[PDB]
Amino acid sequence: WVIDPSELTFVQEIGSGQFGLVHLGYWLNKDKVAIKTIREGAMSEEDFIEEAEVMMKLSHPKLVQLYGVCLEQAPICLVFEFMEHGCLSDYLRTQRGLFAAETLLGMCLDVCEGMAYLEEACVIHRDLAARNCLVGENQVIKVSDFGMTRFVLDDQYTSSTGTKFPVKWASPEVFSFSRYSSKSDVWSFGVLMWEVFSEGKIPYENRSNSEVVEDISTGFRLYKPRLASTHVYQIMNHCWRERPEDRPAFSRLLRQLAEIAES
Numbered sequence: 001w002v003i004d005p006s007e008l009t010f011v012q013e014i015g016s017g018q019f020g021l022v023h024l025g026y027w028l029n030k031d032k033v034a035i036k037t038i039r040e041g042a043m044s045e046e047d048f049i050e051e052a053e054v055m056m057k058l059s060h061p062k063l064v065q066l067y068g069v070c071l072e073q074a075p076i077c078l079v080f081e082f083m084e085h086g087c088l089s090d091y092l093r094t095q096r097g098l099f100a101a102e103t104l105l106g107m108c109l110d111v112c113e114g115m116a117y118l119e120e121a122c123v124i125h126r127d128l129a130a131r132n133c134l135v136g137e138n139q140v141i142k143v144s145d146f147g148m149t150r151f152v153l154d155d156q157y158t159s160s161t162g163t164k165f166p167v168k169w170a171s172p173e174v175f176s177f178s179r180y181s182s183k184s185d186v187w188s189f190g191v192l193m194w195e196v197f198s199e200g201k202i203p204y205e206n207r208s209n210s211e212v213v214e215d216i217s218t219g220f221r222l223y224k225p226r227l228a229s230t231h232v233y234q235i236m237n238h239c240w241r242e243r244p245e246d247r248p249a250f251s252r253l254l255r256q257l258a259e260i261a262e263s
């Protein structure tokens with residue numbers, strides 16, 4: 001699982017943000033890869049290195065694969081399966097108007113398949129959103145970044161009261177207590193379905209973190225996107241039940257969404 005730096009070539013930068021840079025590159029005797037270089041102080045590298053072997057052994061066609069870690073020199077690098085069409089959020093936004101409702105449901109089905117595998121494996125994603133789903137060949141969607149917020153060091157992103165906390169995808173028990181579970185991932189999956197069927201609109205656009213907490217706690221829920229059928233919006237609302245016990249598991253969601261798609 002440890003990749004020697006001499007086994008990697010960096011060709012072109014494809015993305016950058018808070019936490020680091022992503023390059024298109026090549027991994028010796030293997031394939032084209034996406035390489036993430038980590039900025040110093042952005043992650044607990046030691047905690048990640050402890051968990052890396054387990055994360056790499058997780059394998060499913062609907063999960064973006066971690067191929068290994070280049071840790072011999074600072075900054076460290078993480079090597080991933082290259083996803084030709086980038087993130088789902090931008091893929092939807094840039095191609096708005098070019099999607100059939102069936103295609104959007106099929107994208108949700110792909111994510112649900114990956115999530116049902118994580119649920120069975122007792123892996124909590126913690127931050128499921130269209131921005132971390134990736135698009136491959138033939139519009140296949142894969143889930144990435146499951147469990148990665150465990151390693152983020154900026155308490156403003158990880159604390160439920162942090163100024164950068166991703167509250168838009170958080171269930172009430174997550175924004176209140178950081179009580180993560182596959183059922184809090186189900187809430188996030190409902191928000192992801194809304195992002196997909198709204199063709200990449202930002203959920204609770206213009207609402208502050210405090211406003212999202214108050215609105216959700218008082219029963220507000222995201223409106224029905226134009227492209228979501230009655231049945232699809234009913235499933236979204238089931239993901240947003242206040243009590244995690246009342247939300248469907250991903251095993252149940254996978255069958256429900258497949259039944260809707262198959263007709």
Ligand SMILES: *CCC(=O)N1CCC[C@H](n2nc(-c3cccc(C(=O)Nc4ccc(C(C)C)cc4)c3)c3c(N)ncnc32)C1
Nearest residue numbers: 014015019022034036043080081082083087144148151152
């Ligand atoms: C919407 C996202 C975006 O703008 N794009 C375009 C630029 C390239 C981006 N991209 N990211 C990955 C990728 C997949 C899986 C994991 C990662 C990753 O870096 N995860 C991660 C690493 C460290 C941390 C710490 C700070 C804890 C958090 C998360 C990145 C791509 C792949 N595999 N292919 C293609 N483009 C990819 C998407």
